[PDB]
Amino acid sequence: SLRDPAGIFELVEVVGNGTYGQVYKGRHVKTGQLAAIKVMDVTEDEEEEIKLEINMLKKYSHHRNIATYYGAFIKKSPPGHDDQLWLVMEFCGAGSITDLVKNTKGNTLKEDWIAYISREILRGLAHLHIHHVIHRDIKGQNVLLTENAEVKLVDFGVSAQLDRTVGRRNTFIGTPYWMAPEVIACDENPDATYDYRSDLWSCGITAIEMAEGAPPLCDMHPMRALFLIPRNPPPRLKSKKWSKKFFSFIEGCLVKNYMQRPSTEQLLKHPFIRDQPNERQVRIQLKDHIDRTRK
């Protein structure tokens, strides 16, 4: 009951990849409206799981800080080949905040840009949490901007639920640098699970990434980072130039033990997030920066 995308959506060009498959800029054939399309090989036995995932993705993406999910499709392939799942969502033209910080001189964003982006993240997270959804994959590549300097979350955890063989697309662990300590199983933490507060740790790491251009432990092998995170104290900003408010917000996101980590609503009331005077001009500064870099 998932259809071929032919005549409905079509691929335009790659915008990025990693993990598994790639993401294209895509187009709704009949209106010319853009979309992002995630394309990845799947077996036909995955189909039942996909319909559950897409259903969840659509239901929870109707908030201004989440990229809205449009639909999923399966482009059947000739005998022998695997069919391609196409996952179709809102196109975010300005790209990821990881890209942003990369294309910015100094690999560092102004403090008030960081406060604005982090609030937008928290609001998106707030929406998901109240609906009992853990994002579980927060990081710079999963935070996107529109042409109009709007901020949107993408790729919140759906699945795995189904007591099935996990499909290839879900068998890859991914970059670990944004993962909370409690999420990484060890002797004392054998069943290590997500908690909504797991996303808040990730938002703190994303904030450091905006400040320094890379997450903590970036000079280490990913596997070794996996080992260190549950053992290390909370990461810290390296420069002292930042405001007392910024330091305190980082401290809040990065509370080692998640039991005393603040909730999403609490961080939204944190002075660094809550009190933002130059908002309007931030937007404009962001808007203008985006244009400069496209060109």
Ligand X SMILES: Nc1ncnc2c1ncn2[C@@H]1O[C@H](COP(=O)(O)OP(=O)(O)NP(=O)(O)O)[C@@H](O)[C@H]1O
Closest CB to ligand X among residues 36, 254: 36
Would you say 130 or 162 has its CB closer to its own copies?
A: 162
Nearest to 205 by CA among 217, 195, 196: 217
- 93 annotated as a binding-site residue: no
**C-beta of 17 vs 263, nearer to its own copies:** 17
Region binding its own copies by CB under 8 A among candidate stretches 147-155, 158-166, 257-265, 267-275: 158-166
Residue 50 backbone dihedrals phi, psi, to 5 degrees: -60, -40
CA angle, 267 as apex, 266 and 271 as ends, to 5°?
105
- Cβ atoms of 16 and 26 within 8 Å: the answer is no
Residue matched to tokens 């005549």? 7
Site size for Mg ion, by CB under 5 A?
A: 7
Report in angstroms how near the CB of residue 65 gets to its own copies at its nearest.
23
Amino acid, single-letter form, for residue 121? I
- Beta-sheet pairing, 151-153 with 69-75: unpaired
Query: Given the structure tokens 């099935």, which residue do they identify?
Result: 164
| Contact partner, 137, from ligand X, its own copies, Mg ion, none, Cβ < 5-8 Å per class | ligand X
Residue 227 touches its own copies, criterion: CB under 8 A: yes
Determine, following the binding rule CB under 6 A, whether residue 138 of this chain makes contact with ligand X.
Answer: no
Q: In what order do the strands lie in the sheet with 143-145?
A: 95-96, 143-145, 151-153
Size of residue set near ligand X by CB under 6 A: 21
Q: Which of 3, 4, 17, 243 lies at the binding interface for its own copies (CB under 8 A)?
A: 17
List the single partner that 92 binds among ligand X, Mg ion, its own copies, none, CB under 5 to 8 Å by kind. ligand X
- Binding segment for its own copies (CB under 8 A), chosen from 30-38, 56-64, 215-223, 246-254, is 215-223
CB of 230 to its own copies, least distance (A): 9
Instruction: Please identify which residue in 25, 41, 58, 68 interacts with Mg ion, judged by CB under 5 A.
Output: 68
Residue 68 contact among its own copies, ligand X, Mg ion, none, beta carbon within 5 to 8 Å by kind: Mg ion
> Greatest CA separation found in the chain?
61
| CA pair distance 149, 282, nearest whole angstrom | 9
Binding mask 130-149 for Mg ion (x = CB under 5 A): -----------xx-------
Among residues 4, 6, 18, 243, the one that binds ligand X under rule CB under 6 A: 18
Closest CA to 156 of 50, 254, 225, 58: 58
Spatial separation of the C-alpha atoms in residues 92 and 11, rounded to whole Å: 15
Interaction between residue 67 and ligand X (CB under 6 A): yes
Strands 151-153 and 143-145: antiparallel
Among 87, 154, 183, 286, binds ligand X (CB under 6 A): 154
Tokens of 217: 């432990």
| Single-letter residue type at 31 | T
* One residue of 4, 6, 17, 265 binding ligand X per CB under 6 A: 17
Asked if residue 139 lies in contact with residue 167, where contact means CB atoms within 8 angstroms, the answer is no
What is the DSSP-derived secondary structure letter of residue 240?
A: S
**Binding interface with Mg ion (CB under 5 A):** 61, 66, 68, 141-142, 154-155
The footprint of ligand X (CB under 6 A) covers 15-19, 23, 36, 67, 89-92, 95-96, 137, 141-142, 144, 154-155, 174
